[PDB]
Ligand binder design. Structure first.
Ligand code: CLA
Ligand code: CLA
Ligand code: CLA
Ligand code: CLA
Ligand code: CLA
Ligand code: CLA
Ligand code: CLA
Ligand SMILES: CCCCCCCCCCCCCCCC(=O)OC[C@H](COP(=O)(O)OC[C@@H](O)CO)OC(=O)CCCCCCCCCCCCCCC
Ligand SMILES: CC1=C(/C=C/C(C)=C/C=C/C(C)=C/C=C/C=C(C)/C=C/C=C(C)/C=C/C2=C(C)CCCC2(C)C)C(C)(C)CCC1
Ligand SMILES: CC1=C(/C=C/C(C)=C/C=C/C(C)=C/C=C/C=C(C)/C=C/C=C(C)/C=C/C2=C(C)CCCC2(C)C)C(C)(C)CCC1
Ligand SMILES: CC1=C(C/C=C(\C)CCC[C@H](C)CCC[C@H](C)CCCC(C)C)C(=O)c2ccccc2C1=O
Ligand code: SF4
Lengths: 63, 164, 732, 160, 192, 91
């Protein structure tokens, strides 16, 4: 599943720090039952200092 | 650290009343002039024994009567003491911005400013953040000590130069 | 079920916080447990009745103290040389100098001089003797008793009104505009015409001779025959003395404009016509909405139909009628926004156009009456904005407000906050840089090197009003404008004589210092609006914390994680903007009191040379006017300003005490109270005494509130003292 | 204009010139006429007399305080008080705003974009600080081409 | 075709009479707004073409301009001189109450048409000479809005000449312009 | 002057406008806006007994639906205009 590994996606999740921000997909989990399989890496950190977050494919579009 | 931060204010309070007692005590009972036949006229003659027992005397015969040379020093050589007296009040009231406020308000205000920067493509890659809570308290106590100490420095160095 | 009984979650608190928060969550009725719509609106309705009863029981005691311990008749004989007495003082702590020094106004004992302008008001309105004020006090005791009876009555289940009666906005607006604003201003007009105008003309009109004392020589004949100009036929002349029959006229509704030449105050015939005009227009405006009779408006379809078809406002105002009608915080925020803008319109129009006889001559009373309505208006406007924030947390539904104007405020909220931030930063760098520059040039011996900007826009508006001082000569100062020729036979002979006078406060001569402090005022309003719009629009959430709505309105923080989330809530933005309204209204009333304290003793050049730089503000206003303030009591003796000298120092206590809650924060005091609890639990003879409430430190929201309230009490008492001691001890 | 006399014919402005030299002349009375501190007060007097003869020759408006007031409405007589040095300022302030905006675009397309803001690339900086000379033609040029503003779909927006 | 080579917008195809594509600000972009703008452009123009003979022909016959023949109502006594003859019923409450009755009955009957084309050009009783039921129909509607926009520009001229030069009328502005036309233009208003 | 003719003609002019001119404009707007509506229901439908629209007072015998409330509304404007005229004339 997922759009593609190594692709550029835009986050549609409202409560994330990287909403409407360009991110790079580093891992998509193909195991069933995982709610947020797509792991997206960002060039900028959030207030917690991390750049790695998991999103569903419904919360991302290819840009 | 926050106890050091509050003890810095209590050092301001302690040392400021120490130097206030010093300045009034020796301007009233020590410093002055001697005329003929052994008569001693002090700067503020004998008012420490009667006015320094009330806060109204401290505000009136010390903080108002002796501040009548730091505020009308303008247009003279001691006018930089008036400028730093007022700018020291500025740094003190600037301290009250950092001391009374907290990080999350300033972080969301910076988020609005970052939105205005994103609109005009002038977003820095180094993300603008509000100062930390330890850092906000440090900045507030640094401006509080700097502004209040510079206020007392300007008032002292205008008054006792003017009457000395 | 302990105290507080309205919240079950605070009753199981074993600490002192249960005692504290139950005081502070006492009137937040919608946050209570087992709480419904009907109980909300009925408790709010009876709380309104209790508020009305408190206001009328306040006015009754402010009338009873003037009638009982005040010299209202002696002030009526000579309002220029008699100080108005508020109430007598019975203090067991006075020595003989304090009894001998507070005895003013020809009283038999120590009394308080009234700086509330109640004597000027009651004189202008028609009250003359102490018996009339006593009868008014008994009447308003009866009115407050009736409002207590009505408040108890509507909590009884026979007379409980339903929420559909409460949310009936059309009937409420029709009976408010028709009845509250129309029949009360027409009632007023009936007073001003029947009582106040003949008491200004010497005739004693009371209830015993109400039906016999005709207010006009031909009363109610020319009214119903159409010739209303008979009521403007013979106005009061310029030789008219107030309260005496000599020099007086017979016209009850004039349109003279300007001031009465002896009192420097507005004409009672003009205020009677003013009220007949804001009575006809409010009864006519109260027949607007649809209640019961087929005609009228539905405001839901007005708001639905007011959508711009280009889509620039989205859906327009669709869904806003249910948004206001379901949210009590929206209605309260709108009411407080309008109330702040009219309590400030009150303040701006009772100093420049004094409405009460001998109020312009009494200087410290006018100063108190401006500072009163500018502080009450800077707390009412901040309450409006805070209630907008509480609406956005606990009352705003994004599903019901779908792409309307209110949702589009949240859509572009970062643009509003960033542009208020730009405007505040612009005003701050420019006002501070120009004041600091003028300070440097007065410091460096060169007053001519100041950047002094003549406020030519507001001077052009003053010349548009009729001021011939600046010589712009555009309209109402030039005779070639159609507005002047339409006004020069109607109201302008009074207005131009009032505005071309230089002793009054009607549209004062402004200068570069006025420009600079008006940008200080714009800085204050813009930065207070910045913090408050930021609190209201980041109320539901933000990029730091998106779930601020699910944490309530007044939550403390969200923890040290994600950088740090101190003061993240919308209540904390209200908290930070109470300091900004205090600074704003401090600047406003500093400008008012120094522009007037130099006008009243004549030397306006002191303000014109010294207000452009902050050392003039510190030295010629804060230091110079405080000469007889802090000398209210000395080692040598005490004066009559001594209570104002203590209240000044008292303010410097309480304000600075607020710093103890605003700088030092909770866990220091929590460990301190932990050591104190150990010390009490181990001390012999004192361990026997227990606490039931566990001693804890003040909680974080409570700490910010207590420091804010101390800051506000000290701020209002330092300035109430200085302002009522630097004008009432040096009159002029 | 606005009830203000010109400073060349203002009696209060000439009074401030008289009482400023007299303050400095009395400071000169306690020094030797060829001494080094007396040359500073003599240079102060000539700086004061140059200042008062410059303020009166520019058509400045002086009030009842004897002080030069600025008319910022946009008067044809008063352009150099606010309009002329305001356009001089906004050109310089827009120069600061254009070379700081163009530096951030030039370092956002880099390997480590955050190390180029603590350590500012001076050959990259100085090659666009020259380019900030013609910035109204480049700001409205980017505004007309759409490169000045960013579309709201690519802008980080806090949730409602 | 208000600018040769300019792309006409999609909501202005040219089939309307006077559709020259002049909408730079896009006010008629909304379809239901554009149907009101077409019946607003014509009532305005027809009132303007009833106004240009109502201004010049009273001025050319010597009974003053459209301003000095209008100031009598502000005067308590003006007596309402019409063609040099004061009408007996020419009082300000009399002629305004008729105008708030007769025109309001005319405009309410005008707004009652449900058809969006009979609102534009009604015909029937309002066309007794039968030119609407003739060979030429499209060019007369183009004649309506070309004459109408000329009188609409004329009344804008009429109004701002009175603001710029009070006490003078449009033929008196024409007589002032016809004497020395290279000195007394709109530049006297632009440059004071 | 002439109170008995100015008031009567001005009330009769506004009642002529209310009956024959603006009555399709008023009857369309009281149906398009309708009764006031809170949360999707009428105030009387939500439980307010005092918000019931009266029908015995609105029971008109006029063929165009011109009721006594419209008499009390359009005739009130005719007296507001009529006393605007009388105050302007008597000056
Ligand atoms: C008609 C005016 C009016 C009305 C009745 C409301 C109504 C209310 N306000 Mg409001 N408010 C207003 C104006 C008013 N306020 C003004 C004037 C201010 C500015 C000072 C505010 C600032 C304020 C804040 C921001 C908070 C309220 C809240 C509340 C609730 C009362 C809380 C309580 O018991 O406090 C009791 C208060 C005390 C015991 C302290 C008084 C001590 C004095 C100052 C010393 C209630 C919904 C709270 C709320 O809705 O919670 C979500 C809330 O957090 N209000
Ligand atoms: C004609 C009928 C009538 C009238 C007189 C009123 C009267 C009132 N209603 Mg009411 N109402 C009515 C019918 C009526 N209503 C109807 C039919 C509805 C049904 C939907 C309601 C439902 C309703 C609700 C649910 C509430 C009210 C409330 C109130 C009170 C408003 C608050 C107050 O006293 O401020 C007084 C305000 C004014 C006098 C207006 C002053 C305007 C500005 C602010 C001041 C200008 C005055 C002037 C400048 C100041 C000079 C004075 C100075 C010298 C001292 C007031 C007593 C509230 C209340 O307090 O309940 C007890 C309340 O809860 N009513
Ligand atoms: C709600 C307002 C109010 C009320 C209760 C009254 C009440 C009264 N007015 Mg009155 N008055 C008011 C408005 C008011 N006034 C205003 C609006 C005007 C200004 C035009 C006056 C001026 C006026 C005149 C000049 C006279 C009264 C008189 C009267 C009395 C009898 C009225 C009558 O016969 O019918 C009565 C005491 C009449 C009377 O006999 O009073 C002694 C009288 O002729 N009124
Ligand atoms: C002679 C002294 C001088 C100085 C020290 C200041 C100081 C300041 N001004 Mg100010 N100002 C002055 C003259 C002065 N002003 C004059 C004469 C004008 C009239 C045109 C203004 C009008 C003005 C504007 C319009 C703005 C400044 C702004 C600025 C601040 C940031 C500018 C910056 O870094 O660009 C940052 C980069 C930018 C692109 C902003 C520049 C504005 C563009 C050109 C529009 C700075 C603190 C800003 C301010 O205070 O508001 C926050 C701002 O917006 N000032
Ligand atoms: C003299 C004291 C003082 C000074 C200058 C500051 C500084 C300022 N306040 Mg304020 N404020 C203060 C005390 C003061 N405040 C205190 C006591 C508190 C109460 C807790 C606050 C809390 C605070 C909040 C809550 C907010 C402000 C904001 C700001 C800015 C207002 C915009 C402006 O004027 O930019 C001009 C800048 C200056 C005048 C500072 C000049 C310093 C020069 C450049 C040094 C060289 C600015 C940084 C607002 C903000 O930053 O948004 C833009 C904001 O929202 N203030
Ligand atoms: C955003 C900044 C801003 C704001 C909030 C204010 C606020 C105030 N100014 Mg203004 N004004 C400003 C900047 C601003 N001004 C600047 C840049 C100038 C040139 C120095 C002026 C020159 C000016 C004069 C001459 C006077 C005021 C006055 C006033 C008041 C009326 C509004 C007005 O005339 O504004 C006009 C605003 C502009 C011309 C510029 C708007 C902001 C641009 C974009 C920067 C108000 C208190 C009057 C006053 O002080 O009353 C005594 C007065 O007569 N203003
Ligand atoms: C690189 C240049 C750059 C650009 C083009 C702008 C331009 C912008 N900023 Mg600014 N700003 C910058 C630097 C920049 N800023 C930096 C370095 C800071 C930290 C001091 C900020 C802090 C900041 C605040 C606090 C605010 C803005 C806002 C604004 C807007 C109006 C200008 C203004 O308020 O005066 C400029 C404001 C200053 C505080 C002066 C900082 C300008 C410095 C001196 C330039 C340094 C550049 C250099 C290469 C390093 C505009 C979108 C406002 C907004 O939200 O948009 C409407 C606003 O509230 N900015
Ligand atoms: C020159 C002619 C300019 C016309 C440009 C206007 C134009 O471009 O229309 C744009 C907009 C109209 O938008 P609406 O969606 O209301 O209208 C859709 C339009 O297409 C009209 O059909 O008007 C404004 O924004 C109002 C500007 C005047 C603001 C008046 C403020 C009133 C203040 C209170 C009094
Ligand atoms: C957040 C929110 C809120 C709030 C807000 C606020 C609080 C606001 C404010 C605002 C304001 C508070 C405003 C005010 C305004 C006002 C105005 C805007 C005024 C104006 C005026 C005018 C325009 C007039 C005119 C004139 C003049 C000027 C002169 C001459 C005369 C005349 C009359 C003509 C609420 C609650 C809703 C809820 C939701 C949210
Ligand atoms: C034709 C006809 C008929 C008859 C009818 C009639 C005869 C009617 C009349 C009507 C009328 C007879 C009406 C009236 C009305 C009135 C009113 C409704 C009034 C009101 C008033 C007002 C409300 C006013 C106000 C005011 C005042 C009080 C004072 C101040 C000022 C003013 C002016 C505002 C019939 C049915 C047989 C049928 C057939 C046809
Ligand atoms: C104002 C404030 C901030 C915001 C403070 C900030 C963002 C510091 C601003 C530092 C300077 C002005 C910005 C960086 C300047 C750069 C060196 C760029 C130079 C631009 C000019 C200065 C030349 C907090 O973060 C805070 C945190 C906790 C309690 C109170 C507060 C608080 O009061
Ligand atoms: S408890 Fe205090 S210091 Fe800790 S995060 Fe909350 S507000 Fe900040």
């Amino acid at each position: 599943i997922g759009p593609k590994r190594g692709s550029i996606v835009k986050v549609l999740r409202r409560e994330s720090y990287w909403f409407n921000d360009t991110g790079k997909v580093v891992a998509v989990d193909q195991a069933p039952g995982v709610r947020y399989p797509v792991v997206v890496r960002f060039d900028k950190v959030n207030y917690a200092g991390v750049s790695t977050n998991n999103y569903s494919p419904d919360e991302l579009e290819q840009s | 650290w926050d106890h050091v931060f509050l003890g810095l204010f209590w050092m301001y309070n302690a040392i400021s009343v120490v130097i206030f007692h010093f300045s009034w005590k020796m301007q009233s009972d020590v410093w002055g002039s001697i005329s003929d036949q052994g008569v001693v006229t002090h700067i503020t003659g004998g008012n420490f024994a009667q006015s320094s027992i009330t806060i109204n005397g401290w505000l009136r015969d010390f903080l108002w009567a002796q501040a009548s040379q730091v505020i009308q020093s303008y247009g003279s050589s001691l006018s930089a003491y008036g400028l730093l007296f007022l700018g020291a009040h500025f740094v003190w009231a600037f301290s009250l911005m950092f001391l009374f406020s907290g990080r999350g308000y300033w972080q969301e205000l910076i988020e609005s400013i970052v939105w205005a920067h994103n609109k005009l493509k002038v977003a820095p890659a180094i993300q603008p953040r509000a100062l930390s809570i330890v850092q906000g308290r440090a900045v507030g106590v640094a401006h509080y000590l700097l502004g209040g100490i510079a206020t007392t420095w300007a008032f002292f160095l205008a008054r006792i130069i003017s009457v000395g | 079920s302990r105290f507080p009984k309205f919240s079950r979650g605070l009753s199981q608190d074993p600490t002192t916080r249960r005692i504290w928060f139950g005081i502070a969550t006492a009137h937040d009725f919608e946050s209570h447990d087992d709480m419904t719509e009907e109980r909300l609106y009925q408790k709010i309705f009876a709380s309104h009745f209790g508020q009305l009863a408190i206001i009328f029981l306040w006015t009754s005691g402010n009338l009873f103290h003037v009638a009982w311990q005040g010299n209202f008749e002696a002030w009526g004989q000579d309002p220029l040389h008699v100080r108005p007495i508020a109430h007598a003082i019975w203090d067991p702590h006075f020595g003989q100098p304090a009894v001998e020094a507070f005895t003013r106004g020809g009283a038999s004992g120590p009394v308080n001089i009234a700086y509330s302008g109640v004597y000027q008001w009651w004189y202008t309105i028609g009250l003359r003797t102490n018996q009339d004020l006593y009868g008014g006090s008994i009447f308003l005791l009866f009115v407050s008793a009736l409002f207590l009876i009505a408040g108890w009555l509507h909590l009884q289940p026979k007379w409980k009104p339903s929420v559909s009666w409460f949310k009936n906005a059309e009937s409420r607006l029709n009976h408010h505009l028709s009845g509250l604003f129309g029949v009360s201003s027409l009632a007023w007009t009936g007073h001003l015409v029947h009582v106040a105008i003949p008491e200004s003309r010497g005739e004693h009109v009371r209830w015993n001779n109400l039906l016999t004392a005709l207010p006009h020589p031909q009363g109610l004949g020319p009214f119903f025959a159409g010739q209303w100009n008979v009521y403007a036929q013979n106005p009061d002349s310029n030789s008219h003395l107030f309260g005496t029959s000599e020099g007086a006229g017979t016209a009850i509704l004039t349109f003279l404009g300007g001031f009465h030449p002896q009192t420097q105050s507005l004409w009672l015939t003009d205020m009677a016509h003013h009220h007949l005009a804001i009575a006809v227009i409010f009864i006519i405006a109260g027949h607007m909405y649809r209640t019961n009779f087929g005609i009228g408006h539905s405001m839901k379809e007005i708001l639905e139909a007011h959508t711009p078809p280009g889509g620039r406002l989205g859906r327009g105002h669709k869904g806003l009628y249910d948004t206001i009608n379901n949210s009590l915080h929206f209605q309260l925020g709108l009411a407080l926004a309008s109330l702040g803008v009219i309590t400030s319109l009150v303040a701006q129009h009772m100093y420049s156009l004094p409405p009460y006889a001998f109020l312009a001559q009494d200087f410290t009373t006018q100063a108190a009456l401006y500072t009163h309505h500018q502080y009450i208006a800077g707390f009412i406007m901040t309450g409006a904005f805070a209630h907008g924030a509480i609406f956005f947390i606990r009352d705003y539904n994004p599903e019901q407000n779908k792409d309307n104007v209110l949702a589009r405020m949240l859509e572009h909220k970062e643009a509003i906050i960033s542009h208020l931030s730009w405007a505040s930063l612009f005003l701050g760098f420019h006002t501070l840089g120009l004041y600091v520059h003028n300070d440097v040039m007065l410091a460096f011996g060169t007053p001519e090197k100041q950047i002094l900007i003549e406020p030519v826009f507001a001077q052009w508006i003053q010349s548009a009003h009729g001021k011939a001082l600046y010589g712009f000569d555009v309209l109402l100062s030039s005779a070639d404008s159609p507005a002047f020729n339409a006004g020069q036979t109607l109201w302008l002979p009074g207005w131009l004589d009032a505005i071309n006078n230089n002793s009054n406060s009607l549209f004062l001569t402004i200068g570069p210092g006025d420009f600079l402090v008006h940008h200080a005022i714009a800085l204050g309003l813009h930065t207070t609006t910045l913090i408050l719009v930021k609190g209201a629009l980041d109320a539901r959430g933000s990029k730091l914390m998106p779930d601020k709505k699910e944490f309530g309105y007044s939550f403390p923080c969200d923890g040290p994680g994600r950088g740090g989330t101190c003061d993240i809530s919308a209540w904390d933005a209200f908290y930070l903007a109470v300091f900004w309204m205090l600074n704003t209204i401090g600047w406003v009333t500093f400008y008012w009191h120094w522009k007037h304290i130099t006008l009243w003793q004549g030397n306006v050049a002191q303000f014109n040379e010294s207000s452009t730089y902050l050392m003039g503000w510190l030295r010629d206003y804060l230091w110079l006017n405080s000469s007889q303030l802090i000398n209210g009591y000395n080692p040598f003796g005490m004066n009559s300003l001594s209570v104002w000298a203590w209240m000044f120092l008292f303010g410097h206590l309480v304000w600075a005490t607020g710093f103890m809650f605003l700088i030092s924060w909770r866990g220091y005091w929590q460990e301190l109270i932990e050591t104190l609890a150990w010390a009490h639990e181990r001390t012999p003879l004192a361990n026997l005494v227990r606490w039931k409430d566990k001693p804890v430190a003040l909680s974080i929201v409570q700490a910010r509130l207590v420091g804010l309230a101390h800051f506000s009490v000290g701020y209002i008492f330092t300035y109430a003292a200085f302002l009522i001691a630097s004008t009432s001890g040096k009159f002029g | 204009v606005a009830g203000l006399t010109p400073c060349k014919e203002s009696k209060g402005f000439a009074k401030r010139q008289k009482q400023e030299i007299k303050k400095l002349e009395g400071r000169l009375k306690l020094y030797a006429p060829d001494s080094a501190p007396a040359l500073a007060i003599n240079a102060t007097i000539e700086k004061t007399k140059r200042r008062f003869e410059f303020y009166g020759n520019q058509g400045l408006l002086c009030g009842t305080d004897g002080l030069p007031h600025l008319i910022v409405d946009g008067d044809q007589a008063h352009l150099g008080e606010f309009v002329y040095p305001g356009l001089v300022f906004l050109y310089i302030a827009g120069w600061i705003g254009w070379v700081g905006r163009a530096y951030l675009i030039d370092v956002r397309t880099s390997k480590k974009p955050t190390e180029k803001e603590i350590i500012i690339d001076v050959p990259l900086a100085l090659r666009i600080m020259s380019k900030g000379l013609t910035w109204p033609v480049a700001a409205i040029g980017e505004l007309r081409s759409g490169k000045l503003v960013e579309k709201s779909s690519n802008i980080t927006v806090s949730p409602r | 075709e208000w600018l040769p080579g300019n792309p006409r917008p999609s909501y202005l195809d040219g089939s309307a009479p006077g559709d020259f594509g002049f909408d730079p600000l896009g006010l008629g972009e909304v379809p239901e707004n554009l149907e009101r703008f077409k019946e607003s452009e014509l009532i305005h123009a027809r009132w303007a073409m009833l106004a240009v003979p109502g201004v010049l022909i009273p001025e050319a016959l010597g009974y003053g301009n459209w301003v000095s023949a209008q100031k009598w109502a502000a005067t308590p006594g003006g007596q309402a001189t019409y063609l040099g003859n004061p009408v007996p019923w020419g009082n300000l409450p009399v002629i305004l109450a008729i105008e708030f009755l007769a025109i309001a009955f005319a405009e309410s009957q005008r707004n009652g048409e449900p058809d969006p084309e009979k609102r534009k050009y009604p015909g029937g009783a309002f066309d007794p000479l039968g030119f609407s039921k003739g060979a030429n129909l499209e060019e007369l509607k183009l004649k309506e809005i070309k004459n109408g926009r000329l009188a609409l520009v004329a009344f804008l001229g009429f109004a701002v000449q009175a603001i710029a030069y009070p006490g003078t009328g449009p033929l008196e502005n024409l007589k002032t312009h016809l004497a020395d036309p290279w000195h007394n233009t709109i530049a006297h208003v632009i440059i004071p | 002057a002439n109170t008995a003719l100015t008031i009567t003609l001005s009330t009769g002019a506004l009642l002529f406008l209310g009956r024959f001119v603006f009555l399709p404009f008023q009857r369309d707007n009281v149906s398009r806006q309708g009764l006031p509506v809170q949360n999707g229901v009428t105030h009387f439908d939500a439980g307010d007994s005092r918000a019931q629209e009266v029908t015995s007072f609105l029971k008109t015998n006029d063929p165009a639906g011109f009721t006594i409330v419209d008499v009390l509304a359009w005739g009130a404007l005719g007296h507001a205009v009529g006393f605007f005229i009388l105050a302007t004339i008597n000056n």
